[PDB]
Structure of Ubiquitin:
Amino acid sequence: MQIFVKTLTGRTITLEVEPSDTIENVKAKIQDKEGIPPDQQRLIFAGCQLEDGRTLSDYNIQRESTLHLVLRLRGG
Amino acid sequence: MQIFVKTLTGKTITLEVEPSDTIENVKAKIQDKEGIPPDQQRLIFAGRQLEDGRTLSDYNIQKESTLHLVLRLRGG
Amino acid sequence: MQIFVKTLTGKTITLEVEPSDTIENVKAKIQDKEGIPPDQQRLIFAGKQLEDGRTLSDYNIQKESTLHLVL
């Protein structure tokens, strides 16, 4: 399935995923296409921060859902 | 009365307000709830930016209306 | 000279800089206090996106100014 990932400045990217993909897996796809390492990524859906060990289906993320990608700091 | 505000990352917050509340007062209330600084907040209702000196009632903002926070950007 | 770098999430970084420092210097300093490479950084002062090749003086960024950092 196709999901959208939006940054704060409106840039949107489109990824192909499956509902059983884990968040860490999605973060690795984001790295591969945009060069941002996973540790600098914080993903959010509907105000909810997404945890690395879970899957997209654990947060009811579906066809054409929109995630938010924001910066994560070490001290964070 | 209650209104709703969508944050930049898709979180929905509820405010307690009155129709005579100014936009500024709403921005402050948002800060108290979510810690977002007023300089950072740009508010939208029905596609129009809310000017800081006006009231909710001026924009026909009724109970259970939803406003959207968007990123305040200006090319230069 | 201390500035504040804020993310739109809710974190604040304090940096020590001088008004002659270039935007690229400042991004290098951010790349150190945290490991965010410069090409993945967008700095905003009071609405204006900051570009390479300027200095903090050029934008009139004084001590205790607040920048915003976004992806």
Remarks:
- The interface with chain B takes residues 8-10, 44-48, 66, 68, 70 of chain A (CB under 8 Å).
- The beta strands of chain A are 2-7, 12-16, 41-45, 48-49, 66-71.
- Chain A has one domain: 1-76.
